[PDB]
Amino acid sequence: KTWEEIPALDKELKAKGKSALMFNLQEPYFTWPLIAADGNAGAKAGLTFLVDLIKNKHMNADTDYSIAEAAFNKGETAMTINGPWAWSNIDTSKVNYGVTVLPTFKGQPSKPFVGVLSAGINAASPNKELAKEFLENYLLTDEGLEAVNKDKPLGAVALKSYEEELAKDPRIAATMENAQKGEIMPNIPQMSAFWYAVRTAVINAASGRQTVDEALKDAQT
Amino acid sequence: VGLNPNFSFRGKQQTRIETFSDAVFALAITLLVLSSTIPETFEDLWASMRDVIPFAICVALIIVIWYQHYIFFLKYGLQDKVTILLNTILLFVLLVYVYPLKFLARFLSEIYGGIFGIIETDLSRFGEYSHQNLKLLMVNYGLGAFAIFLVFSLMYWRAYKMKSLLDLNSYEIFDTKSSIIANLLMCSVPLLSLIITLIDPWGNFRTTILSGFLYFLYVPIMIVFGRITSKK
Amino acid sequence: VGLNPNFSFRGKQQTRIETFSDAVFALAITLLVLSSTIPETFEDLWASMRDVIPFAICVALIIVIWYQHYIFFLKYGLQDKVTILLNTILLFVLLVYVYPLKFLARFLSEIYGGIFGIIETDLSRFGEYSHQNLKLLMVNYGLGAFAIFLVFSLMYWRAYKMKSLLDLNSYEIFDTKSSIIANLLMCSVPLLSLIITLIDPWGNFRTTILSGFLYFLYVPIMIVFGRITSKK
Amino acid sequence: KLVIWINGDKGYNGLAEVGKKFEKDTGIKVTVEHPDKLEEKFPQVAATGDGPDIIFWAHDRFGGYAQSGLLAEITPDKAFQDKLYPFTWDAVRYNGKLIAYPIAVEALSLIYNKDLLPNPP
Numbered sequence: 001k002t003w004e005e006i007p008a009l010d011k012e013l014k015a016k017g018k019s020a021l022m023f024n025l026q027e028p029y030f031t032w033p034l035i036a037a038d039g040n041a042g043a044k045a046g047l048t049f050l051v052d053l054i055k056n057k058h059m060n061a062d063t064d065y066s067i068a069e070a071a072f073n074k075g076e077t078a079m080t081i082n083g084p085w086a087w088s089n090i091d092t093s094k095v096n097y098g099v100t101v102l103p104t105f106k107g108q109p110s111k112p113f114v115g116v117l118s119a120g121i122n123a124a125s126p127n128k129e130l131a132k133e134f135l136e137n138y139l140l141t142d143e144g145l146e147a148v149n150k151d152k153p154l155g156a157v158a159l160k161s162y163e164e165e166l167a168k169d170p171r172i173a174a175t176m177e178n179a180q181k182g183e184i185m186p187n188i189p190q191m192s193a194f195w196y197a198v199r200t201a202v203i204n205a206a207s208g209r210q211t212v213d214e215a216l217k218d219a220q221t
Numbered sequence: 222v223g224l225n226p227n228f229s230f231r232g233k234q235q236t237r238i239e240t241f242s243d244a245v246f247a248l249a250i251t252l253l254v255l256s257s258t259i260p261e262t263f264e265d266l267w268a269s270m271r272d273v274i275p276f277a278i279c280v281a282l283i284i285v286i287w288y289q290h291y292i293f294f295l296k297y298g299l300q301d302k303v304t305i306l307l308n309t310i311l312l313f314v315l316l317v318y319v320y321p322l323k324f325l326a327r328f329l330s331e332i333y334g335g336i337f338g339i340i341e342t343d344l345s346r347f348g349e350y351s352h353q354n355l356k357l358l359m360v361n362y363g364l365g366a367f368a369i370f371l372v373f374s375l376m377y378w379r380a381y382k383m384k385s386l387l388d389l390n391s392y393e394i395f396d397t398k399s400s401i402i403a404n405l406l407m408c409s410v411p412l413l414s415l416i417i418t419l420i421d422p423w424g425n426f427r428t429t430i431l432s433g434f435l436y437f438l439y440v441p442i443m444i445v446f447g448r449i450t451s452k453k
Numbered sequence: 454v455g456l457n458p459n460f461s462f463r464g465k466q467q468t469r470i471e472t473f474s475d476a477v478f479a480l481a482i483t484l485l486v487l488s489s490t491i492p493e494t495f496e497d498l499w500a501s502m503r504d505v506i507p508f509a510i511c512v513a514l515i516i517v518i519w520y521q522h523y524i525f526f527l528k529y530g531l532q533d534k535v536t537i538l539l540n541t542i543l544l545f546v547l548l549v550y551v552y553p554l555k556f557l558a559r560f561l562s563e564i565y566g567g568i569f570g571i572i573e574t575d576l577s578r579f580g581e582y583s584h585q586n587l588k589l590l591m592v593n594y595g596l597g598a599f600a601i602f603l604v605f606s607l608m609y610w611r612a613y614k615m616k617s618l619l620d621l622n623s624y625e626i627f628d629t630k631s632s633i634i635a636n637l638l639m640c641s642v643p644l645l646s647l648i649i650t651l652i653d654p655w656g657n658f659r660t661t662i663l664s665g666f667l668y669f670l671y672v673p674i675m676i677v678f679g680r681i682t683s684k685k
Numbered sequence: 686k687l688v689i690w691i692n693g694d695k696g697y698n699g700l701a702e703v704g705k706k707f708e709k710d711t712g713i714k715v716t717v718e719h720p721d722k723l724e725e726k727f728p729q730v731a732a733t734g735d736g737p738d739i740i741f742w743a744h745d746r747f748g749g750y751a752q753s754g755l756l757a758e759i760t761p762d763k764a765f766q767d768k769l770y771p772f773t774w775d776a777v778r779y780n781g782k783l784i785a786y787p788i789a790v791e792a793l794s795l796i797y798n799k800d801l802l803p804n805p806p
């Protein structure tokens with residue numbers, strides 16, 4: 001239920017030839033919840049913990065989406081941090097899985113960023129009216145979203161008609177739980193430069209180049 | 222058969238905890254009645270039939286607890302250490318309050334018998350009706366009721382804590398949360414009598430009147446506590 | 454194993470209501486026997502063996518109720534609030550009449566013992582055999598029997614009220630309807646003694662003779678009530 | 686060609702499977718049609734044009750067809766007659782003449798969702 005009790009659990013699991021937690025450390029979207037759990041003082045706390053996990057050899061230095069996914073699906077790691085989309089691949093494997101609340105850090109919850117999967121029409125396209133037809137009458141329909149969802153789960157769909165079906169799924173409940181504890185990302189043009197600043201900062205601190213104090217300095221600029 | 226249409230009953234298969242529990246409930250209601258002496262003469266027979274009103278009240282009370290138990294184990298199908306622990310605490314409280322309930326039920330049946338005018342038999346058999354004894358009456362039975370509902374709240378909270386392990390959906394999560402609130406609200410009324418009695422503001426029977434009067438205003442006082450949390 | 458070949462048994466799986474119920478029935482027949490004192494000497498041992506005739510009659514009576522219970526829960530597999538309520542009322546009545554049955558069975562065993570000429574022991578142990586006491590004997594046990602059959606009728610009517618939910622076929626509907634009639638007809642005989650005793654037309658033992666004589670004419674009187682409804 | 690008129694809310698596909706077994710044992714085609722407003726299209730078409738060979742509808746509409754002269758008198762032998770309930774034959778009788786073959790008794794019931802409503806009104 002807490003981030004701070006993972007090192008103990010990892011010691012226990014490493015004795016039996018298993019990892020505790022493996023997730024994508026390269027992409028900052030996955031590390032941000034821990035960083036933003038308290039908050040600055042909050043970012044310094046959250047990241048130092050993440051740095052200590054790699055320093056204590058609990059997590060690998062270059063842990064990416066593929067080796068994390070594969071390891072969990074194989075049955076090598078006890079935990080992973082991922083989205084709705086990742087569930088179908090677990091179902092394919094013979095792993096009795098559960099989706100739950102993200103661990104708390106310094107008592108307070110880990111605040112994951114909330115994304116709204118969205119479809120936009122390219123300004124330089126001649127098929128603008130044909131795409132509108134596809135998006136409205138064929139995709140954003142009960143039947144249409146069902147098709148996408150049975151391949152790889154969408155999460156909490158924007159369609160009003162899908163509320164009953166969403167509410168019947170335990171994994172969706174866990175997703176909504178984390179979404180409430182998190183916050184929706186502003187759409188602003190500066191998001192790109194922000195994400196890059198966090199992507200470098202996390203990689204530098206993970207590998208062992210820049211200090212945790214120096215990471216937030218370069219990132220705030 | 223079931224309370225909610227959106228709830229997926231995990232405990233349709235009978236388990237040892239439930240079997241054991243059924244034995245205890247059956248034993249409680251059975252020994253309450255059959256702890257009495259066997260009539261040897263017509264006089265004893267008629268005396269023993271005066272006990273049915275007190276027993277009906279006791280039995281009604283025990284099955285109500287049994288029902289809540291049935292619904293909990295039906296909902297979650299739980300069988301872990303902590304559930305076993307809380308379950309034992311529950312049955313323990315039940316058991317220690319079986320004979321005291323027989324007592325209270327007989328006592329109140331005589332008091333209500335006198336009021337309505339059905340009978341006019343003595344209450345000197347029960348001992349002296351003093352302020353200290355009448356206060357301890359509230360505190361005792363009030364502590365009993367509080368505990369039962371307190372334990373039901375803890376049991377539902379244990380299920381809430383294992384929501385993911387149990388694969389609880391949004392409807393089931395909501396039910397569980399509502400069941401915790403319900404049991405805490407139920408527990409609050411005996412907790413409030415008990416506290417009022419233990420402080421004893423008046424230093425006389427007035428204390429006992431108020432403490433006793435909170436049970437008659439169960440429904441309205443429960444609504445006040447529920448309304449306070451929703452208003453904020 | 455089953456009563457009807459056209460009936461689809463919904464209650465083949467054991468449930469909590471049935472498990473609880475089995476505990477109570479087992480406890481009733483067990484404590485009836487084992488409520489006696491433990492023999493400490495040869496004299497007590499022989500005395501205790503005189504109790505087997507009264508106990509056999511009591512046990513036979515209780516399993517007959519258990520059987521009806523087994524068949525009902527086998528037929529419908531019911532587990533709702535109202536079924537729980539009616540089920541509790543049943544077990545409650547059973548329980549309150551366990552020790553009174555032990556009494557009646559011992560009393561009647563002495564009376565029938567005197568008749569046949571097996572024994573010649575005193576009935577003064579039972580208290581005074583007065584008109585009021587012998588009337589209360591009928592009213593008591595008559596009220597008990599009436600209630601048990603009344604409850605079985607209510608239980609079958611609850612299943613009839615849920616015929617659609619239970620997916621009852623034309624044969625099953627017919628059985629259910631017939632089971633209601635059967636239990637009401639069974640209940641009618643103790644209801645008729647009870648009423649005759651409570652009015653007391655003669656003001657003497659004659660009342661008790663008639664009231665008692667309706668049980669000996671159970672089968673024929675049941676046929677009269679059944680024939681009256683069919684003739685119209 | 687054997688043509689049958691039955692309502693679209695009924696089992697015309699199944700009626701066709703019976704018709705398919707008929708063609709195997711005889712050689713006659715059995716097409717099953719389900720046109721809209723057949724109860725009021727039959728007495729107009731069958732009077733003037735050809736229409737169907739056999740018409741399927743609840744017994745209530747058949748007296749009007751019988752009075753108008755749009756239906757042949759049914760003459761079934763005792764052995765066939767005896768296979769069906771005598772009360773059913775009464776429904777298909779107009780002025781002491783059998784005007785149709787009884788198939789089934791139909792009555793509306795309350796259909797309810799047990800999940801949304803376990804104890805319905």
Ligand SMILES: OC[C@H]1O[C@H](O[C@H]2[C@H](O)[C@@H](O)[C@@H](O)O[C@@H]2CO)[C@H](O)[C@@H](O)[C@@H]1O
Nearest residue numbers: 026027028029030083115117191192195
């Ligand atoms: O990693 C930073 C990256 O995170 C988010 O992208 C998510 C995307 O939203 C998810 O659907 C998922 O596929 O993973 C991506 C990260 O791996 C932001 O949306 C994106 O701007 C940002 O670059």
Ligand SMILES: [Rb+]
Nearest residue numbers: 255256487488
């Ligand atoms: Rb005892």
